[PDB]
C-alpha cells in the first residue's frame, strides 16, 4: 500500500455522493481521496516525461587552438591581411601596434596585426526544444488496501484518462495539462551527462561559440573568440590561449534551475504539477456487504504511526472463510465500544478464501488515549493507543 | 640602436660633471640618460626571472567519480557506515532520509544514510613559494649609437653590478631590489600552462580540493567534497555527480592578476619595477676629440620622427679617415649656422677605417622649421624639418 | 582506428612533377582532422611538406608552398600532394599523417614511400 | 620561422641509465610540443603531447617536460627496443617544425 510514507501528502475529502472531486498533482507526492461509500483511493503524479525533443542550439565550453600564424603591416601601408582570416576553422583577431625601425618600418607608428590560429571545439552543450506533442504524465492510481493498481498516461493533447479497477469500477481524470509547467519559455539543456531546463533568453545570451543544430561533416562555430584570449601584441606576432573549460562556471550558473534527467532518449522531469479532476460516479466499494470475518486476526507488526498522524496496522488472519469484512475500529470505552476516529482504508475486506492472509489498515485515531479493536467477540484484538497531536 | 622605438622611454639628464643619476627602470620601457661630457647611455629592464620555485600548494580542478556504495539505518537503528568512508580514495556524505513501512524499517522517521565514491583527479594547479634568493633582474646597457653593449645581473642579494662599456670605460649600478615588487605576499600559480602571480591569502581561500607539495605515490586529496556533489537522497541510496571542471572559472577569477610565463624551469616575469641609481664617473666619450670627418655622408632612409618628437637618421659615410668625429648639428639660418635643438646621440663618431659605413644619429630638433645638417663645407647634407610639437 | 597508405611514383625526372596519393581506410576522411604530407631524405631529419582539412582549406610550408598543392578526394576517401620543378633535394620518404581532434600533433602515420629524383 | 634545436645529436647510454634529451625553441612555443619515436625503416610514433602529456600504447618510463624556449625528453630506464632516434615537433606556431633529431643507441 502506497503513500503511506510520503512526505507530501495531501487528503482530499469527498462530498455527499458527489460525482468529482478536485486534486492538485505534486511530484514525489501523493494524494488520497476519501468519499464517503466509496472505496479510499490514492493518486500518485509518478513521472513527467518529454521525448523527441529537437536541438535548438549547442554551445562550445572546452575547445583547444594551435598552428598560429600573424600578418603586420607598416604604418600607412594598408590593412594585415591572412588566407585563413575568413577560414572557419580558424579564429583571428585584428589589432594596432607600435613600429617603427627597430622592426621594419621605416616610419615609427601604428601598424595593422591580424593573428589567426586553428579552432577545434573539445566539448559542448546542447539546448533542445520542448513542445506539448511530446510532454507525457504518468499518474498512478492505487485502491486503499487489499489489477487494484492502474497507470495512465495524461497528456497536453489527451488530459481525460479512465482506469478501470477491477472489483471497484472505474476513476475518471480530467486534468489541466496547461496549467502544469510552462514549456514554451524553456529549452533542455543537456551538458556533461547533467541536464536542466533553462529558460530561452537565458540560453540565447550564454556567451559562447555556438552552431543552429548539429548537421554533419562540419559544424560551423560562430564566437569562437569567447574561449580564445588574445595577448601581447609585438610587431610582428601576438599569443592565443584558451581559456578554461567553461563547464563548472555554467554548472554554477545553473544552481537554481530545474533539474532533469535522462533515459533512453527520454527526457524525466521532476518539477511536477498538475491540476485535475477526479470523476467518481462509477467508482465503488466492493459492492457486496460481506459477512464479518469469523475467525481470529493477529498482529504482524506493531502498529505505526506514520508521518501525518495516522496509523498502519498489519495483520493476519486465520480464517476461510474469504471473502469477508474485516471488523476493525477505534474505541475509548471497551464496553459500549462507541466507534471514534475513523479508517483511512475505508471498509477493509479479506478477499483471500485461504487462511494465514494478510491485511494492511490505515486508521486516523483521535487524540489522547484509544484502543485500536479488530475482531469479533472474545478473540478480537486490542492495542493501546496514544495520539500527542504534533 | 635601442629605446628608439620603445613606447615607455624616460629620459634622464645628468647634473654638471655629476657622479650619480637616479632612473626607474619598468618592464618592456627605457631609460635614455644624457649628462655633459658624456657618451648618451641606454638602460633597459629586460627580464625579471624566478628559479627554483617550491610547490606550496596543490588544487584539484578537474575530477571524476566511480563506483559508489550507500549504506542505510533505519530510524533508531544508529549511524550508517562504509568501510570506504574513511578511505583517502573516496569521497562521502552523511545524511537523513524519510523512512518507513514501504522501504523495510518498521517505523516512521528519519534514518542515517551514507554514500561514498571513488574520486579520481583528473586535472590541478600549483601554487610555488617565490624566495628573493632565486630572483633575479637583467639589465641591458647600449652606448646611444656607435662591446658597446653589456648585460648585468641584479639581484637581491647583489643589487650592485659594474657593467663595462669598451672604449667608453664603464658604469655602475646601484639598484634597490626591495621597492621592486613584493613576492613575500606572492604565489607563482601555475595551471594548464597558464602562469599568474597571486596574493597568498586569495590562494589559501581557494575553495578546491588540495594537497601539500605533491609528494610521490598517492597524494592525499583534502575537501574532495569542493568537485562532487551529492543530490535526491533516496532510501537506500544517494546519486553523486562531478562539478564541471573549474578552470575556466579560475580564469575569470584571475582577470586582473599579473600574468607571467615559464621558460625551462624558470618562471620569468613582466611586472617590471627597479629604482636605481646609476654611477658615471668612469663613463667617458672615446677620450680623443678626433679629426672631424672629411668626406661626405649620404642618408641611407629620410630622418623619421620617432613617438617622442626626437628625429633619427642614419647616414652612409664615404670617406676612409675613420676614426673621424662626425658633423651633425641643427640650424635655421644657413649662412651663421646657429646650432640649434640638441643631440641625443652625443658626440656621434664614425669609428671604422672602411668607406661606406653606417652611423645612426638621434637629434632633439626645435619647434618649428628647421634644418638638419651634417657635413663639412661644400658636400655637407641639409634636411628641413618641422616639428609640431604634438 | 584508420589505416593511411601512400603510393606513387618512386621515381621523378628532374623539373618534373612528383605525384602522390594517401589511402585512408578503417576512417572517413571527413572526420575532424587535418591530414599532414611530411617528409624525409634519408639519414636526415623530417620535414613537415604540407596540410589539408577536408573542407578543401590548406597550409603549406613557406619555403616550399610555391611547388606544393594538396587536395582531397572523399570519392575514393584519399588526399594528394602534388610537387612540381622537383629538384636533387625533393629525394625523400614521403609520409602522409593525420592530426588528432584537439589540433594535436601527428598521431597516425602511413608506411612512407620514398621517392628519388634523377635522371 | 620557429628554429627547434635538439641536443645532443647522438647519444650511448647503457641499459637501464637515465637518458636525457633537450629541446630548445628559438621563439617561445608555451607547451605545444611533442616527442616521437622513430624506429628505422618505419614511421616515427608520437611518444608525448603537450609538453607533458603520457601518450596511450607508451612506456611510463618516457616523460616530458618544461615550457617555453626548453623542454626535456626523459627516458628513466634505458631498454633495448629504446635503440631509435627521437624528434621534437612545435605546433605552436604555423609552420610547425622538427628538431634535428635525437640519435640514442645502446651500450652492451
Known amino acids: 500500500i502506497r503513500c503511506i510514507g510520503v512526505s507530501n501528502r495531501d487528503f482530499v475529502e469527498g462530498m455527499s455522493g458527489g460525482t468529482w472531486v478536485d486534486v492538485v498533482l505534486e511530484h514525489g507526492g501523493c494524494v488520497t481521496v476519501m468519499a464517503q461509500d466509496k472505496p479510499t483511493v490514492d493518486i500518485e503524479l509518478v513521472t513527467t516525461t518529454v521525448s523527441n525533443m529537437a536541438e535548438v542550439r549547442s554551445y562550445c565550453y572546452e575547445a583547444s587552438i594551435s598552428d598560429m600564424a600573424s600578418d603586420s603591416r607598416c604604418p600607412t601601408q594598408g590593412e594585415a591581411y591572412l588566407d585563413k582570416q575568413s577560414d572557419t576553422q580558424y579564429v583571428c583577431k585584428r589589432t594596432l601596434v607600435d613600429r617603427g625601425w627597430g622592426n621594419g618600418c621605416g616610419l615609427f607608428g601604428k601598424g595593422s596585426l591580424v593573428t589567426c590560429a586553428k579552432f577545434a571545439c573539445s566539448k559542448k552543450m546542447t539546448g533542445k526544444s520542448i513542445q506539448p506533442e511530446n510532454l507525457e504524465y504518468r499518474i498512478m492510481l492505487s485502491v486503499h488496501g487489499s489489477e487494484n493498481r492502474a497507470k495512465v498516461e495524461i497528456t497536453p493533447n489527451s488530459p481525460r484518462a479512465e482506469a478501470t479497477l477491477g472489483g471497484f469500477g472505474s476513476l475518471g481524470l480530467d486534468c489541466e495539462p496547461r496549467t502544469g509547467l510552462d514549456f514554451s519559455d524553456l529549452y533542455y539543456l543537456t551538458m556533461n551527462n547533467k541536464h536542466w531546463l533553462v529558460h530561452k533568453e537565458w540560453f540565447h545570451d550564454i556567451p559562447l561559440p555556438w552552431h543552429a543544430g548539429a548537421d554533419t561533416g562540419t559544424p560551423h562555430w560562430n564566437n569562437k573568440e569567447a574561449l580564445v584570449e588574445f595577448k601581447d601584441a609585438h610587431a610582428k606576432r601576438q599569443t592565443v590561449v584558451v581559456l578554461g573549460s567553461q563547464e563548472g562556471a555554467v554548472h554554477t550558473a545553473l544552481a537554481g534551475a530545474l533539474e532533469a534527467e535522462m533515459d533512453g532518449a527520454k527526457g524525466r522531469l521532476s518539477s511536477g504539477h498538475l491540476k485535475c479532476r477526479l470523476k467518481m460516479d462509477k467508482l465503488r466499494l466492493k459492492g457486496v456487504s460481506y459477512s464479518l470475518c469469523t475467525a481470529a486476526f493477529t498482529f504482524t507488526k506493531i502498529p505505526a504511526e506514520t508521518l501525518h498522524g495516522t496509523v498502519t496496522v498489519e495483520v493476519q488472519y486465520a480464517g476461510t472463510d474469504g471473502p469477508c469484512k474485516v471488523p476493525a475500529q477505534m474505541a475509548v470505552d471497551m464496553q459500549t465500544l462507541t466507534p471514534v476516529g475513523r479508517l483511512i482504508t475505508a471498509n477493509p475486506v479479506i478477499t483471500e478464501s485461504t487462511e494465514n492472509s494478510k491485511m494492511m489498515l490505515e486508521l486516523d485515531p483521535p487524540f489522547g488515549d484509544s484502543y485500536i479493536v479488530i475482531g469479533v467477540g472474545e478473540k478480537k484484538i486490542t492495542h493501546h493507543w496514544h495520539r500527542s497531536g504534533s | 640602436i635601442r629605446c628608439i622605438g620603445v613606447s615607455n622611454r624616460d629620459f634622464v639628464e645628468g647634473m654638471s660633471g655629476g657622479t650619480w643619476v637616479d632612473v626607474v627602470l619598468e618592464h618592456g620601457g627605457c631609460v635614455t640618460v644624457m649628462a655633459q661630457d658624456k657618451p648618451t647611455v641606454d638602460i633597459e629592464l629586460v627580464t625579471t626571472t624566478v628559479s627554483n620555485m617550491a610547490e606550496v600548494r596543490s588544487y584539484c580542478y578537474e575530477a571524476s567519480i566511480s563506483d559508489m556504495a550507500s549504506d542505510s539505518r533505519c530510524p533508531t537503528q544508529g549511524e550508517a557506515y562504509l568501510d570506504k568512508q574513511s578511505d583517502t580514495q573516496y569521497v562521502c556524505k552523511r545524511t537523513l532520509v524519510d523512512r518507513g513501512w514501504g522501504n523495510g524499517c518498521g517505523l516512521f522517521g528519519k534514518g542515517s544514510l551514507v554514500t561514498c565514491a571513488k574520486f579520481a583527479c583528473s586535472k590541478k594547479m600549483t601554487g610555488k613559494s617565490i624566495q628573493p634568493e632565486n630572483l633575479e633582474y637583467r639589465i641591458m646597457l647600449s652606448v646611444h649609437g656607435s662591446e658597446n653593449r653589456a648585460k648585468v645581473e641584479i639581484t637581491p642579494n647583489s643589487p650592485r653590478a659594474e657593467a663595462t662599456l669598451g672604449g667608453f670605460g664603464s658604469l655602475g649600478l646601484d639598484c634597490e631590489p626591495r621597492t621592486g615588487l613584493d613576492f613575500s605576499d606572492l604565489y607563482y600559480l601555475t595551471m594548464n600552462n597558464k602562469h599568474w602571480l597571486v596574493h597568498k591569502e586569495w590562494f589559501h581561500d581557494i575553495p578546491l580540493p588540495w594537497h601539500a607539495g605533491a609528494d610521490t605515490g598517492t597524494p592525499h586529496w583534502n575537501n574532495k567534497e569542493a568537485l562532487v556533489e551529492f543530490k535526491d537522497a533516496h532510501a537506500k541510496r544517494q546519486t553523486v555527480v562531478v562539478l564541471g571542471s573549474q578552470e575556466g572559472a579560475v580564469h575569470t577569477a584571475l582577470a586582473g592578476a599579473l600574468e607571467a610565463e615559464m621558460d625551462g624551469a624558470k618562471g620569468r616575469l613582466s611586472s617590471g619595477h627597479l629604482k636605481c641609481r646609476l654611477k658615471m664617473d668612469k663613463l667617458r666619450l672615446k677620450g680623443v676629440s678626433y679629426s672631424l670627418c672629411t668626406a661626405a655622408f649620404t642618408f641611407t632612409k629620410i630622418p623619421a620622427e620617432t613617438l617622442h618628437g626626437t628625429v633619427t637618421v642614419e647616414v652612409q659615410y664615404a670617406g676612409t679617415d675613420g676614426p673621424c668625429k662626425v658633423p651633425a648639428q641643427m640650424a635655421v639660418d644657413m649662412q651663421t649656422l646657429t646650432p640649434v635643438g640638441r643631440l641625443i646621440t652625443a658626440n656621434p663618431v664614425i669609428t671604422e677605417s672602411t668607406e661606406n659605413s653606417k652611423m645612426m644619429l638621434e637629434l632633439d630638433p626645435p619647434f618649428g622649421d628647421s634644418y638638419i645638417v651634417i657635413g663639412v663645407g661644400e658636400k655637407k647634407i641639409t634636411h628641413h624639418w618641422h616639428r609640431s610639437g604634438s | 582506428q584508420v589505416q593511411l597508405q601512400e603510393s606513387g611514383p618512386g621515381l621523378v625526372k628532374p623539373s618534373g612533377t612528383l605525384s602522390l596519393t594517401c589511402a585512408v581506410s578503417?576512417?572517413?576522411?571527413?572526420?575532424?582532422?587535418?591530414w599532414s604530407w611530411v617528409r624525409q631524405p634519408p639519414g636526415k631529419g623530417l620535414e613537415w611538406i604540407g596540410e589539408?582539412?577536408?573542407?578543401?582549406?590548406?597550409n603549406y610550408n613557406p619555403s616550399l608552398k610555391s611547388r606544393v598543392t594538396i587536395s582531397v578526394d572523399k570519392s575514393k576517401n584519399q588526399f594528394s600532394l602534388k610537387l612540381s620543378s622537383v629538384t636533387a633535394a625533393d629525394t625523400a620518404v614521403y609520409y602522409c599523417?593525420?592530426?588528432?581532434?584537439?589540433?594535436?600533433?601527428?598521431?597516425?602515420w602511413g608506411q612512407g614511400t620514398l621517392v628519388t629524383v634523377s635522371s | 620561422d620557429i628554429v627547434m634545436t635538439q641536443s645532443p645529436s647522438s647519444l650511448s647510454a647503457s641499459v637501464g641509465d637515465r637518458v636525457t634529451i633537450t629541446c630548445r625553441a628559438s621563439?617561445?612555443?608555451?607547451?605545444?610540443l611533442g616527442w616521437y619515436q622513430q624506429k628505422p625503416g618505419k614511421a616515427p610514433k608520437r611518444l608525448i603531447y603537450?609538453?607533458?602529456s603520457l601518450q596511450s600504447g607508451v612506456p611510463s618510463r618516457f616523460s616530458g617536460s618544461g615550457s617555453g624556449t626548453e623542454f626535456t625528453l626523459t627516458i628513466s630506464s634505458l631498454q633495448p627496443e629504446d635503440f631509435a632516434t627521437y624528434y621534437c615537433?612545435?605546433?605552436?606556431?604555423?609552420?610547425?617544425?622538427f628538431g634535428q633529431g635525437t640519435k640514442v643507441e645502446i651500450k652492451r
Open positions: 599523417a593525420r592530426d588528432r581532434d584537439d589540433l594535436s600533433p601527428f598521431d597516425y
Open positions: 578503417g576512417g572517413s576522411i571527413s572526420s575532424s582532422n587535418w
Open positions: 589539408i582539412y577536408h573542407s578543401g582549406s590548406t
Open positions: 621563439q617561445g612555443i608555451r607547451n605545444d
Open positions: 603537450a609538453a607533458s
Open positions: 615537433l612545435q605546433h605552436n606556431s604555423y609552420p610547425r617544425t
